[PDB]
Structure formats: C-alpha cells, structure tokens
Design a binder for this molecule. Structure first.
Ligand SMILES: [Zn+2]
Ligand SMILES: [Zn+2]
Ligand SMILES: [Zn+2]
Length: 178
C-alpha cells in the first residue's frame, strides 16, 4: 500500500484499501472510512466494480438524462466519487470551507456554497436527484466568478471547475462531442 493519502497527499493516520494500493485519512475518503468491514474496498475500487458489472454503462449519455436520475445507491456513489475527485486537487482548499465576502465594489452571492457543505448534504441524503448535487457544485464556481470579477483570483474558480467538469463527463460517461 501507499504511505500518503490519495486525496491530500500527506502521511498521517491512514486506512489502506484491501483491493488496491491506495490509502486515505478517515475524513479524506468519501464516504468517511467505515468502522469495521474486513476486507475494506475504497471508493475507487467500488466505482471500478460498477463499470465491470455493466460494461455498456460506459456508452455515451446525454447530460440532461444523467441530471434527472434519482439518487439511488450507485448514483449516490458516483456523486461521492466526483466530489472526492475535486478534493484531490490542492486548489480545492479555496472552496472547502464557508466563505465570506467583504470586497470594495462587490456584493456577496445570494446563495453561498462550499465543498464541505455539499459533503454534508450528500452525507445526509439531501439530494433526491443528480441535478441537486451538480447544481450546488457549479454554484460554487459561479459564485466565485461573480464576486472576484476582474481580479486574477477568478482563475482559481475556472481551474477547479474544469477538474469538476472533466471528471463529471468521465464518471457519468457523457457523450463526447466537438
Ligand atoms: Zn488526506
Ligand atoms: Zn481500492
Ligand atoms: Zn448487467
């Protein structure tokens, strides 16, 4: 197994996966690492298995169809994974915790959002469809863009959104286009 967290790339108190070499801190894994379960499989492994069990799930889908899906166990897991994929980028630190807004010539967003809030929402099963999750994720980056305006810091929003969007298209096998 690995000696650093797959998500945050640090050593510490790690829990090792039984079916692959990855390792995680307890609250870096999504969901948080389970109390017992021997063997244990991580979220990467559990996603692999869904794809192997249904090979045609990798065929192209329309975004619109994927968003209307109900949050049944397998879509809940893919959303969890997609969220984990964003936390794997170090720049996620700017979007993790609750923001505040006091900049000359800007107003705060009507609906603030951050990664840890979406984590808690997924944890508490507050989304009934994929759409609710995706909307809150996009809202994070949209809020950033509108607030920081021409300040070059807006680039951080574009960049982490791109990681979100790429992984969205991969996990949910969105039809490739030109
Ligand atoms: Zn970690
Ligand atoms: Zn694994
Ligand atoms: Zn099948």
């Amino acid at each position: 197994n690995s000696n650093i967290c797959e998500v945050c790339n640090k050593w510490g108190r790690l829990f090792c996966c039984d079916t692959c070499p990855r390792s995680f801190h307890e609250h870096c894994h999504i969901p948080s690492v389970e109390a017992n379960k021997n063997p244990w499989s991580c979220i990467f492994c559990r996603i692999k298995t869904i794809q192997e069990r249904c090979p045609e799930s990798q065929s192209g889908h329309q975004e619109s169809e994927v968003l209307m899906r109900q949050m049944l166990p397998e879509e809940q897991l893919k959303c969890e994974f997609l969220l984990l994929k964003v936390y794997c980028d170090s720049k996620s630190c700017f979007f993790a915790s609750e923001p505040y807004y006091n900049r000359e010539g800007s107003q705060g967003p009507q609906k603030p959002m951050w990664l840890n809030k979406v984590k808690t929402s997924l944890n508490e099963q507050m989304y009934t469809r994929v759409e609710g999750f995706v909307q809150d994720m996009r809202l994070i980056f949209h809020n950033h863009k509108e607030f920081y305006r021409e300040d070059k810091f807006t680039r951080l929003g574009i960049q982490v959104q791109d990681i979100f969007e790429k992984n969205f298209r991969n996990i949910f096998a969105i039809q490739e286009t030109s």
